Structure 1
Amino acid sequence: GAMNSSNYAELFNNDIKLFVDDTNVYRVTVHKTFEGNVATKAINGCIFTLNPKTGHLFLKIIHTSVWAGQKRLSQLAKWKTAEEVSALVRSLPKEEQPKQIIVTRKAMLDPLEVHMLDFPNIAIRPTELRLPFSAAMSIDKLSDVVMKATEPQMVLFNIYDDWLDRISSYTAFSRLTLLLRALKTNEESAKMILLSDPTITIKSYHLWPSFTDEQWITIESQMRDLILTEYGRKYNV
């Protein structure tokens, strides 16, 4: 059934699996109308579909045109997500299709189950983990490709850069979630930590800076400190 801290290492075994996060599919700015009412303006979104073992990210850009003339958009957004994931599985060769898909939000279970009726052998699972994938749009290069899209588009990334050359997928996933947790809690502080030393650059083909192994320990330390502080402030403890 549900994925939790008791069955954590299952993410890094050799059964192909994908996480699906729909938290950035339907994105709005709320604003006042001339008559003093409130209205929303949609902006481009994305489905965040990630293989936690390999770091392969299937970033499906959701262009604002998909919402034109539709009702109940927060509900449609779950079904559009399920439709695009299902289209992605069908597009993969059989030996690349996932054996499980884990949804970060339980409201995706029925939409995805119904879109995947043709794949009875693919397990659709919820998680009790509070994963920070909502912060994907705090990664500058992902935010850039979403906001510039003029039509629906799939962009492929490796969210771990070249880390798996040096560390395991357990450790790579731990670094990713720490980075995204920090970006979610205090974007400004997190972003300062990552680019404070302009001698460390981001390769054209990468998302994150080119940190040595010792620099990553210092960075990881600074992200934990940031997360703890913000927690003390939040809860006055």
Structure 2
Amino acid sequence: GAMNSSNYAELFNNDIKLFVDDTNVYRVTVHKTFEGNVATKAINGCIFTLNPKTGHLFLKIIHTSVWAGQKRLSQLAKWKTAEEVSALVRSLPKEEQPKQIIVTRKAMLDPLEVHMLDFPNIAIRPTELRLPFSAAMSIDKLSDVVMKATEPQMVLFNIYDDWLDRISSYTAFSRLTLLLRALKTNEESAKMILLSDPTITIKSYHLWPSFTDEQWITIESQMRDLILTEYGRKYNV
């Protein structure tokens, strides 16, 4: 059934599974028209499909042309997400296909279930966790490839860089969700934290900076401070 804190280590067992987050698929700016009405302009979006054990990120870029001439775009976006996830699964060798797909929003359950009827042995599951994957577009190398795309495109990212050389998947996922929770709560502060020291760089082949083990503990502490702090400024405590 639903994924929660009781069954949290199941994410790091050896059954292949993917998270699917659809919150950045349909993105718009809202603006005034010359007549003083309001209109939307779509911008490129992305499906965030993540293996939490390996860090492999299947980033399907959603080009604004897919919305041309379509109605009820927020509803379409869920079905388009499910269509692309289904297409991804079918593209994978049988031994790489997931046993479970966990959707971050319950509104994806029926669209994904219908698209995966062909795969009755793949479990489609909700979660009670409030995962911060919407903040993926706060990662510089991911936002850049999405905004530059001129056509539909899949890029395969590893969102853990080489952390798994030094830490376990459980710890890597915890670091990722802490970084993303911070970027979501106060993007500027979070980004200041991550790039303050100009002697810690992001390699050309890495998304996040090359922190030593010790520096990661400092960084992680600063992010928890930030998230507690903005848990103050927001609520006054």
TM-score range, shorter chain: over 0.9
What are the Cα deviations for residues 119-155 of structure 1, in whole angstroms up to 9, with x where unaligned?
Answer: 0000000000000000000000000000000000000
d(CA) in 2 for partners of 1:4, 1:84: 26
Q: CA deviation at 1:82?
A: 0.1
Which SS does the other structure have where 1:47 is aligned?
strand
d(CA) in 1 for partners of 2:64, 2:205: 27
Which SS does the other structure have where 1:235 is aligned?
coil
What are the Cα deviations for residues 68-87 of structure 1, in whole angstroms up to 9, with x where unaligned?
Answer: 00000000000000000000
Which SS does the other structure have where 1:25 is aligned?
coil
**1:1-237 correspondence runs (5 A):** 1-237=1-237
Q: CA deviation at 1:234?
A: 1.2
d(CA) in 2 for partners of 1:53, 1:196: 30
Q: CA deviation at 1:29?
A: 0.2
Which SS does the other structure have where 2:234 is aligned?
helix
The percentage of counterpart residues that share the same residue type is: 100
Q: CA deviation at 1:216?
A: 0.2
d(CA) in 2 for partners of 1:91, 1:217: 39
What are the Cα deviations for residues 193-215 of structure 1, in whole angstroms up to 9, with x where unaligned?
Answer: 00000110001111000000000
Moved over 3 A (4+): none
Unaligned runs of 5+ in 2: none
Q: CA deviation at 1:233?
A: 1.4
Q: CA deviation at 1:171?
A: 0.1
Aligned length: 237
d(CA) in 2 for partners of 1:235, 1:102: 31
Unaligned runs of 5+ in 1: none
d(CA) in 1 for partners of 2:51, 2:175: 15
Q: CA deviation at 1:105?
A: 0.1
d(CA) in 1 for partners of 2:235, 2:196: 28
Q: TM-score, normalised on structure 1?
A: 1.00
Q: CA deviation at 1:236?
A: 1.5
